[PDB]
Enzyme design. Structure first.
Site, PDB file in Angstrom:
ATOM      1  N   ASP A   1       0.827  -1.214   0.000  1.00  0.00           N
ATOM      2  CA  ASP A   1       0.000   0.000   0.000  1.00  0.00           C
ATOM      3  C   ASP A   1       0.862   1.266   0.000  1.00  0.00           C
ATOM      4  O   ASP A   1       0.507   2.265  -0.636  1.00  0.00           O
ATOM      5  CB  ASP A   1      -0.935   0.034   1.229  1.00  0.00           C
ATOM      6  CG  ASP A   1      -2.315  -0.617   0.999  1.00  0.00           C
ATOM      7  OD1 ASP A   1      -2.559  -1.324  -0.002  1.00  0.00           O
ATOM      8  OD2 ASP A   1      -3.192  -0.416   1.878  1.00  0.00           O
TER       9      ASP A   1
ATOM     10  N   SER B   1      -3.624   2.472 -10.670  1.00  0.00           N
ATOM     11  CA  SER B   1      -4.743   3.394 -10.459  1.00  0.00           C
ATOM     12  C   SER B   1      -4.701   4.572 -11.444  1.00  0.00           C
ATOM     13  O   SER B   1      -5.670   4.803 -12.182  1.00  0.00           O
ATOM     14  CB  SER B   1      -4.770   3.874  -9.000  1.00  0.00           C
ATOM     15  OG  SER B   1      -6.013   4.535  -8.732  1.00  0.00           O
ATOM     16  N   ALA B   2      -3.579   5.310 -11.509  1.00  0.00           N
ATOM     17  CA  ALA B   2      -3.474   6.418 -12.469  1.00  0.00           C
ATOM     18  C   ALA B   2      -2.855   6.008 -13.810  1.00  0.00           C
ATOM     19  O   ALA B   2      -2.978   6.753 -14.788  1.00  0.00           O
ATOM     20  CB  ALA B   2      -2.647   7.574 -11.876  1.00  0.00           C
ATOM     21  N   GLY B   3      -2.223   4.850 -13.893  1.00  0.00           N
ATOM     22  CA  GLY B   3      -1.552   4.417 -15.115  1.00  0.00           C
ATOM     23  C   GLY B   3      -0.235   5.124 -15.439  1.00  0.00           C
ATOM     24  O   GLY B   3       0.110   5.230 -16.619  1.00  0.00           O
ATOM     25  N   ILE B   4       0.519   5.566 -14.428  1.00  0.00           N
ATOM     26  CA  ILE B   4       1.812   6.225 -14.660  1.00  0.00           C
ATOM     27  C   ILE B   4       2.922   5.748 -13.732  1.00  0.00           C
ATOM     28  O   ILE B   4       4.110   5.780 -14.093  1.00  0.00           O
ATOM     29  CB  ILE B   4       1.670   7.762 -14.578  1.00  0.00           C
ATOM     30  CG1 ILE B   4       1.176   8.232 -13.207  1.00  0.00           C
ATOM     31  CG2 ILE B   4       0.764   8.254 -15.680  1.00  0.00           C
ATOM     32  CD1 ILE B   4       1.168   9.777 -13.056  1.00  0.00           C
ATOM     33  N   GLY B   5       2.580   5.312 -12.529  1.00  0.00           N
ATOM     34  CA  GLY B   5       3.598   4.962 -11.546  1.00  0.00           C
ATOM     35  C   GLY B   5       4.103   3.529 -11.598  1.00  0.00           C
ATOM     36  O   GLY B   5       5.137   3.262 -12.220  1.00  0.00           O
TER      37      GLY B   5
ATOM     38  N   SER C   1       2.742   1.281 -13.381  1.00  0.00           N
ATOM     39  CA  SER C   1       2.678   0.953 -14.806  1.00  0.00           C
ATOM     40  C   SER C   1       3.953   1.389 -15.530  1.00  0.00           C
ATOM     41  O   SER C   1       4.455   0.686 -16.426  1.00  0.00           O
ATOM     42  CB  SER C   1       1.457   1.644 -15.441  1.00  0.00           C
ATOM     43  OG  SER C   1       0.197   1.107 -15.011  1.00  0.00           O
TER      44      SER C   1
END
Ligand SMILES: O=C(O)c1csc(-c2ccc(C(F)(F)F)cc2)n1
EC number: 3.1.3.48
Length: 284
Positions: free
Chosen positions: A181, A216-220, A222
């Site tokens: 988390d 969740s945001a598709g940048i970190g 991912s």
């Protein structure tokens, strides 16, 4: 500099935050005008994470073609990826429309549906074989075929049917279930094992459309997945593997989607993963 010794030099000097801020300063800035239109407000999870216009995936629909998703095309490595946000209650049908239209074989999920006591994405796939899902806005049906639960990840076989044409396709769902988390994993060993399982399935290969990857945001998280994959492929292709520059690869990927790698801890973890992964590839 090489990677493993540049790594120890940043650790000993404690300068990860300064390295990461340099990347943020040099990163590309391109317009994202379609994402910001008022009609698309409920299609974006976070107001500060948007796809660039030049690289956004378009839905094959004349009413509204918008989804928060980007095509990352890596020319030298000969790999492509679609990076997207976790689907929202009002975009689960758009998500599967994209998978269908782009001819993807695999979906890579790096988050849990609930983390830190809050919802991080919609429950967008079926949990029981006999309880299939129908997405009426895009005319698709989705069925759970099988599920294999392991200690760090789960693999699912799904059937996606285009109800307009009665065509069907098999989609593989690769779910990394153990990212903590807070922070990053202590060892990259389970993340690398997971990456190799995705590779072995064919989901990253040129005979299919691009893999769809999300958190969740598709940048970190991912961004960490595609950065590690591309760097390891370049180390196999080139005459001189020590010429692979992870900061330069990350800046190339940020031409196609903003914000990839969200913290200095994620940057350090990406270095660690590429370093350890390069030893396992050989050939040792
Ligand atoms: O050793 C090196 O530095 C090296 C080997 S191949 C290479 C390279 C290949 C292709 C491309 C691109 F055209 F595909 F963009 C750009 C650089 N660099």
């Amino acid at each position: 500099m090489e990677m493993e010794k540049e790594f120890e030099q940043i650790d000993k000097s404690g300068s990860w935050a300064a390295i990461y801020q340099d990347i943020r300063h040099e990163a590309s800035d391109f317009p994202s005008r379609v994402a910001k239109l008022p009609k698309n407000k409920n299609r974006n999870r976070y107001r500060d994470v948007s796809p660039f216009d030049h690289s956004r995936i378009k839905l094959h629909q004349e009413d509204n073609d918008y989804i928060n998703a980007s095509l990352i095309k890596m020319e030298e490595a000969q790999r492509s990826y679609i990076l997207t946000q976790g689907p929202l209650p009002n975009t689960v049908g758009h998500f599967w429309e994209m998978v269908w239209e782009q001819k993807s074989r695999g979906v890579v999920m790096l988050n849990r549906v609930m983390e830190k006591g809050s919802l991080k994405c919609a429950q967008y796939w079926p949990q029981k074989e006999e309880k299939e899902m129908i997405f009426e806005d895009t005319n698709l049906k989705l069925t759970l075929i099988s599920e294999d639960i392991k200690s760090y990840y789960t693999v699912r076989q799904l059937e996606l049917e285009n109800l307009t044409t009665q065509e069907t396709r098999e989609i593989l769902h690769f779910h990394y279930t153990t990212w903590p988390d807070f922070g990053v994993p202590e060892s990259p060993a389970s993340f690398l094992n997971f990456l190799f399982k995705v590779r072995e399935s064919g989901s990253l290969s040129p005979e299919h459309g691009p893999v769809v990857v999300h958190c969740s945001a598709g940048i970190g998280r991912s961004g960490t997945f595609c950065l590690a994959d591309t760097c390891l492929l370049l180390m196999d292709k080139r005459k001189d593997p020590s010429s692979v520059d992870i900061k330069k690869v990350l800046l190339e990927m940020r031409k196609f989607r903003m914000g990839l790698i969200q913290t200095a801890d994620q940057l350090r973890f990406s270095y660690l993963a590429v370093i350890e992964g390069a030893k396992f590839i050989m050939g040792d």
